[PDB]
């Protein structure tokens, strides 16, 4: 199978970059987008090999590939791999976001930069495990290994303006609140395990085995809490978000982080591939709290973004605001909300990479990253502000980028089974305009506001160009035609959704 | 109102009471042996006292 | 004959004033001294054990006990010369400079 | 029992290293000879490490009614004999800048050993008491080793001043066994009680004053408050086996009583370690996140660790992997702890008076040590228990036995005890890679003594790095050595 190699070349690729740095410190960059080229290559050709558009749900579980290997045999632990057409749309990409992390920290051709390029490696290896993971232990590891390759490069390589002590200070505050979140989930998926052997005779760590293992209400609700507090650290799900702002803004300026390490959905992933089979009944009962905590999040999210100053921030609560939508889609049952929450899933990796992107190229030019300190920009540049707007008319959810899909689909499934919730949530689609058109209002538009901007700056590279260009092309065809995306995921999504349902009833 | 993120800082009294527990638990670590030998003494006491209350 | 409960407290109260000694005086001296009433006084409450049970262990604890109490009291009183020598001081008190 | 042929090939370990002692001894007394003496120390402890394959296979047998070597008394021999060797290839660089008798710390790190073997096959009352003091009374001049240096001798004065307290309250404890018991050995112990007498009040208390004992010796609350003073004031290869050969080899003789005793299943015992284990868990993170001394932040961590492990021994009379997770476990603290005390003495070697013990001199290590810094880092995520090292495979198992033995509270405060220590771990980590332009940093030794307790720390990373992605490999050994039951 190829499963395996989707986890080993981007691994294999960051020791050759820290070992390739001896032939200079401008090779480690081609080594890593190599790595990342062919692990994206990988992952087309799955696709292009795996009929998702012609398979029919068959029922959970259903694998269009899989790997096992024994890795502890005591424990029942093996490295078990499987692709769905939901984990084929989050390989795919990881590797392009994966490609464009490597491309954003071209111009960093500092001494140590091979160390650099192994960590983001890593990262993107660790990313692709969580995805392909149906061993429960191996689906922990991997949640838990990628976050110290992200915590040295927060605290090493993080925003060149901040010191080392606010560097430091967000990458220990990211650590803390994600590694804590894992560990809460390895005493559920423990506890999962010997509810299975009591309640059965079998020690097994793999998903299939324990999709139906009788338990409790009691039980069954404390297990899913537990998984929850991992899938609500890493969505964020308010009030658990804290760590996502500063994260962003000590981050690498360029964005590498953020796209590799924190625009990939594994917790979204998480709870539809895991919660809401293992525990179905759970997630039923907990569906009014976790919308309301969607909800929540819309509004304070959008709330927050407006009173940001720094753009990066801003665009950091954006994503709190906009990820509370597909929480509350996860918990309707809906198909129409499910496939709406992937369209969203990968169109706000895309929307958001574009603005990540853009918010670094800016500072290279000004060297600032407060808005205070811009203004009529638009004037001073030649692409940077144009596709800013274009990325946050996406933002917003303009139709025809993409983000619209997503965002309706789930509210026109919501509505069907709670309509109050959706009523109340499509009002955050007034909240998202004003701070989007803040942000462009703020920035590009009106008088400069400090001398930097008040001269003209440097034009985007065709590299920068290519890298942005891209997400606008990915983005407006997602708008005009996202049927060969839902055709892929349909599938998968149709399984967990009649799972749920049927097993609730 | 909500401009300094109010929830994150109701998110971190776990980390203000941790840090004021370090401090006052860091206050028995005087170098004072006599003090050190009282300790043994005390918990000796308490282990004791435990074992015959849940015997 | 001798209740056994009667000997194990004549121990008990003499290892409770050992450790009084122990914390209630500032000089090492004096602290060392207690130490040697608190070994001496469970070496007795072996002997009072083997006693009642008319066997030789606990006179062979004794011994390892008393094998122990004289290693100790030699490396004990080492460490007194040497804060004396160097302090001129035996007050344990001033012995508290690592803290914190 | 008597000592039979047979008998004699199982105490291989114990005749070894003890004859090793004496030729030692009498090579000093011939002529002091750093060198020599130091190589003649090191090649009888690997001999003993060797003849545990000839032990192997004799089998399980016990010696006297003393000692009973099995499986488990092979494991923990190979632990304290490992921690031995790597404290003599620490101290050669070391005791180099020791303008003083240096023979005769050979001396005394060879009869610790000899304590933790002892505690290592011990079966009986007066086994345990001796082997402590065997550990414990070389120890006493090894943490004063540097008598000249002021907190040298304050650690050696607060050390042997407690551990003399601590083994009258383990004498007395014993003592009050034996009244109701009448027989010294594990087995023995509470086994003439009848069904439900099992709380016989004298023999509760019998245990509580040995807890006091051993608790101190294991540095668990509220025995605790030396364990930064001595661990700091001790040499740095003296902390290297205080933190190391003396707990591993009386947790396990810690095991072997409460698994071979019948009272051991008291609910009040448990209970009161339950609370102990709590306390540790939590007072020791929270004591070490404000330390800049790295010696005192290891002993506060040496704390919580000792925390974790007593969570298996509350779950000893629940399941069976409870003697599995705390071989894995102290292989993993042992290979952890050798690489952080370690890397501190190499940097503090040759002895030059204070040792480099201030967060301070390690702000930038890696500009200056590259391969010290990288092992830190490795060892410092192992303590924290970080999925990709030895140290998280450790934490797996205590969490897995405290989940199948329901104690929610102790899983829970191990949860809470992780996520405190995280912030203290990654802050020593990360400080390594930061740029310290000031450099009061001495320059490295360059003789192949002080460059063979560099391939120790690295070794010892290398397999933390390596069983913390494939672990079989070491569980398959740990289940192999169980206890005679
Ligand atoms: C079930 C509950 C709901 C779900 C929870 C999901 C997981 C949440 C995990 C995080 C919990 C809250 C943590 C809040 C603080 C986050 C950052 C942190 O730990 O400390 C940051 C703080 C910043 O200060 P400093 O680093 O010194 O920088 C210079 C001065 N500003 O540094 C400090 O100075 C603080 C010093 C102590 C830091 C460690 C102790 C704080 C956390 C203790 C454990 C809390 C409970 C976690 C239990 C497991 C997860 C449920
Ligand atoms: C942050 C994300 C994690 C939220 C954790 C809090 C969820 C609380 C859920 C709850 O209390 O549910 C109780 C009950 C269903 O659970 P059951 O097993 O029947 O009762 C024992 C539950 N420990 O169901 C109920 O009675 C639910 C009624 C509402 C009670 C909980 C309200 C929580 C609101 C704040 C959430 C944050
Ligand atoms: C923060 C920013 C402002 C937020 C404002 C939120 C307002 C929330 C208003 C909720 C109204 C709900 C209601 O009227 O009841 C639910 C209603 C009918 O529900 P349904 O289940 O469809 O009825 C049975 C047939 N299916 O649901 C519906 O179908 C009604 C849909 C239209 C709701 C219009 C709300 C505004 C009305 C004034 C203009
Ligand atoms: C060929 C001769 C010349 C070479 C000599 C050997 C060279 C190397 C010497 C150093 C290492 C020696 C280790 C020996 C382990 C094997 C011992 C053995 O005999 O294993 C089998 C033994 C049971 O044997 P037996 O009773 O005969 O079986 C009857 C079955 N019906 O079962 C046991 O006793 C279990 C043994 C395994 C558990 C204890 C291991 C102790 C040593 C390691 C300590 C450290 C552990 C951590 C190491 C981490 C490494 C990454
Ligand atoms: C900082 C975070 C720290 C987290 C620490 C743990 C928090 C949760 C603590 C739960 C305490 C137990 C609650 C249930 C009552 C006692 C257990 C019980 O009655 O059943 C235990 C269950 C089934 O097995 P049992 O009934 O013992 O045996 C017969 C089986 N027919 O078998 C079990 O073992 C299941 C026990 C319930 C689920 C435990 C796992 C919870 C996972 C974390 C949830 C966090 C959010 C809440
Ligand atoms: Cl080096």
Redesign the pocket.
Same mark, same amino acid.
């Given at each position: 199978m190829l499963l395996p190699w989707l986890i080993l070349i981007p691994f294999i690729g960051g020791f050759l970059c820290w070992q390739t740095e001896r032939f200079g410190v401008k090779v480690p960059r081609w080594i890593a987008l190599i790595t990342m080229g062919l692990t994206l290559a990988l992952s087309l050709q799955l696709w292009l090999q795996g009929g998702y558009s012609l398979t029919q749900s068959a029922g959970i579980p259903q694998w269009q590939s899989e790997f096992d290997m024994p890795w502890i045999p005591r424990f029942g632990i093996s490295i078990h791999l499987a692709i769905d057409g939901l984990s084929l749309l989050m390989v795919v990409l990881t590797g392009l976001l994966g490609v464009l992390a490597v491309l954003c920290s071209w111009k960093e051709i500092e001494k140590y930069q091979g160390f650099f390029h192994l960590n983001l490696m890593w990262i993107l290896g660790g990313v692709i495990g969580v995805f392909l993971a149906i061993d429960m232990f191996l689906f922990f590891f991997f949640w838990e290994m990628m976050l110290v390759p992200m915590y040295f490069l927060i605290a090493l390589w993080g925003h060149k303006a901040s010191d080392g002590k606010t560097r430091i200070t967000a990458a220990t505050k990211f650590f803390i609140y994600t590694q804590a979140s894992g560990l809460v989930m390895l005493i559920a998926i423990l506890a999962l395990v010997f509810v299975h052997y009591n309640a059965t005779g079998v020690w097994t760590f793999n998903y299939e085995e324990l999709l139906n293992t009788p338990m409790s209400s009691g039980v069954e609700y404390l297990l899913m809490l537990g998984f929850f507090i991992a899938f609500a650290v890493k969505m964020p799900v308010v009030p658990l978000h804290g760590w996502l702002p500063d994260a962003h803004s000590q981050a690498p300026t360029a964005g590498s982080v953020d796209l590799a390490g924190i625009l990939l959905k594994t917790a979204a992933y998480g709870l539809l591939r895991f919660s809401l089979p293992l525990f179905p009944n759970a997630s039923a009962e907990f569906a009014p709290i976790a919308m309301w905590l969607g909800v929540i999040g819309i509004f304070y999210g959008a709330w927050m973004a407006f009173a940001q100053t720094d753009i990066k921030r801003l665009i950091a609560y954006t994503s709190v605001s906009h990820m509370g939508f597909v929480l509350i889609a996860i918990y309707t049952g809906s198909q129409l909300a499910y496939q709406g929450a992937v369209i969203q899933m990968i169109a706000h990796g895309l929307s958001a990479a574009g603005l990540f992107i853009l918010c670094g190229q800016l500072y290279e030019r000004i060297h600032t990253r407060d808005m205070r300190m811009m203004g009529g920009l638009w004037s001073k540049m030649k692409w940077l502000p144009a596709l800013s707007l274009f990325f946050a008319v996406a933002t917003l959810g303009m139709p025809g980028t993409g983000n619209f899909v997503g965002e309706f689909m789930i509210l026109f499934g919501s509505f069907q089974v709670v309509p109050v919730i959706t009523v109340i949530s499509t009002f955050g689609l007034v909240f998202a305009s004003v701070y989007s058109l803040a942000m462009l209002h703020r920035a590009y538009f009106g008088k400069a506001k400090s001398q930097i901007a008040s001269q003209e700056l440097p034009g985007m590279s065709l590299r920068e160009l290519f890298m942005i260009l891209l997400l606008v092309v990915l983005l407006v065809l997602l708008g005009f035609y996202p049927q060969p995306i839902l055709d892929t995921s349909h599938s998968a999504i149709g399984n967990i959704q009649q799972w749920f349902v049927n097993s609730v009833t | 109102l909500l401009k300094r993120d109010p929830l994150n800082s109701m998110m971190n009294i776990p980390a203000v009471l941790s840090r004021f527990a370090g401090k006052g638990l860091l206050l028995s670590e005087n170098g004072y042996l006599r003090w050190y030998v009282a300790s043994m003494s005390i918990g000796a006491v308490v282990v004791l006292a435990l074992l015959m209350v849940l015997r | 004959m001798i209740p056994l409960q009667h000997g194990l407290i004549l121990a008990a109260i003499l290892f409770v004033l050992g450790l009084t000694g122990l914390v209630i005086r500032r000089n090492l001296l004096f602290m060392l001294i207690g130490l040697e009433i608190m070994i001496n006084a469970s070496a007795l409450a072996f002997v009072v054990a083997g006693s009642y049970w008319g066997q030789t262990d606990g006179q062979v604890m004794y011994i390892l006990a008393i094998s122990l109490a004289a290693a100790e009291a030699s490396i004990g009183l080492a460490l007194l010369l040497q804060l004396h020598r160097r302090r001129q001081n035996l007050n344990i008190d001033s012995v508290s400079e690592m803290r914190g | 029992m008597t000592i039979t042929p047979q008998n004699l090939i199982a105490l291989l370990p114990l005749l070894i290293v003890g004859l090793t002692v004496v030729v030692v001894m009498l090579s000093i007394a011939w002529r002091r000879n750093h060198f020599l003496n130091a190589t003649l120390s090191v090649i009888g402890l690997n001999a003993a /490490?060797?003849s /545990?394959?000839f032990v192997?296979?004799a089998? &399980?047998m016990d010696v006297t009614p003393l000692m009973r070597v099995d499986?488990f008394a092979? +494991?923990y021999?190979? /632990?304290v004999l490992?921690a031995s060797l790597a404290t003599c290839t620490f101290a050669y660089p070391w005791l180099e800048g020791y303008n003083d008798n240096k023979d005769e710390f050979y001396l005394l790190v060879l009869i610790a050993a000899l304590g933790g073997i002892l505690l290592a096959n011990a079966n009986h009352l007066a086994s345990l008491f001796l082997g402590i003091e065997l550990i414990s009374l070389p120890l006493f001049g090894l943490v004063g080793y540097a008598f000249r240096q002021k907190r040298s001798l304050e650690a050696s004065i607060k050390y042997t001043i407690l551990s003399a307290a601590a083994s009258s309250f383990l004498l007395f404890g014993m003592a009050l066994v034996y009244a109701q018991s009448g027989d010294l050995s594990f087995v023995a112990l509470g086994k003439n009680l009848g069904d439900g007498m099992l709380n016989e009040p004298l023999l509760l208390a019998g245990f509580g004053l040995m807890i006091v004992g051993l608790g101190f010796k294991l540095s668990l609350v509220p025995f605790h408050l030396w364990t930064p003073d001595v661990y700091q004031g001790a040499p740095a290869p003296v902390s290297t086996f205080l933190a190391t050969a003396s707990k591993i080899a009386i947790f396990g003789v810690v095991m072997r009583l409460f698994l071979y005793a019948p009272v051991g299943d008291s609910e009040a015992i448990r209970v009161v370690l339950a609370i102990i284990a709590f306390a540790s868990i939590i007072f020791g993170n929270l004591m070490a996140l404000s330390q800049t001394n790295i010696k005192r932040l290891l002993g506060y961590s040496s704390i919580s660790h000792l925390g974790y492990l007593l969570v298996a021994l509350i779950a000893l009379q629940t399941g069976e992997m409870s003697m599995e997770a705390v071989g894995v476990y102290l &292989?993993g603290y042992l290979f952890s702890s050798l690489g952080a005390f370690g890397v501190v003495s190499l940097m503090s070697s040759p002895y030059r008076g204070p040792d480099a013990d201030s967060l301070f001199s390690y702000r930038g290590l890696f500009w200056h040590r590259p391969i010290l810094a990288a092992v830190m880092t490795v060892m410092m995520l192992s303590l924290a228990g970080i999925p990709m090292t030895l140290g998280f495979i450790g934490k797996f198992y205590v969490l897995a036995v405290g989940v199948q033995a329901h104690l929610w509270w102790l899983v829970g405060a191990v949860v809470v005890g992780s996520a405190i220590g995280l912030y203290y771990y990654l802050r020593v980590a990360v400080s390594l890679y930061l740029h310290a332009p000031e450099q009061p940093g001495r320059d490295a030794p360059s003789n192949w003594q002080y460059s063979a307790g560099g391939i120790v720390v690295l070794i010892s990373a290398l $397999?933390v790095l390596v $069983?913390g992605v494939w672990p079989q490999? $070491?569980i398959s050994?740990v289940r +192999? &050595?169980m206890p005679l039951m």
């Open positions: - | - | - | /490490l060797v /545990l394959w192997g296979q089998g &399980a499986g092979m +494991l021999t190979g /632990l490992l &292989a $397999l $069983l490999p $070491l050994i +192999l &050595a």
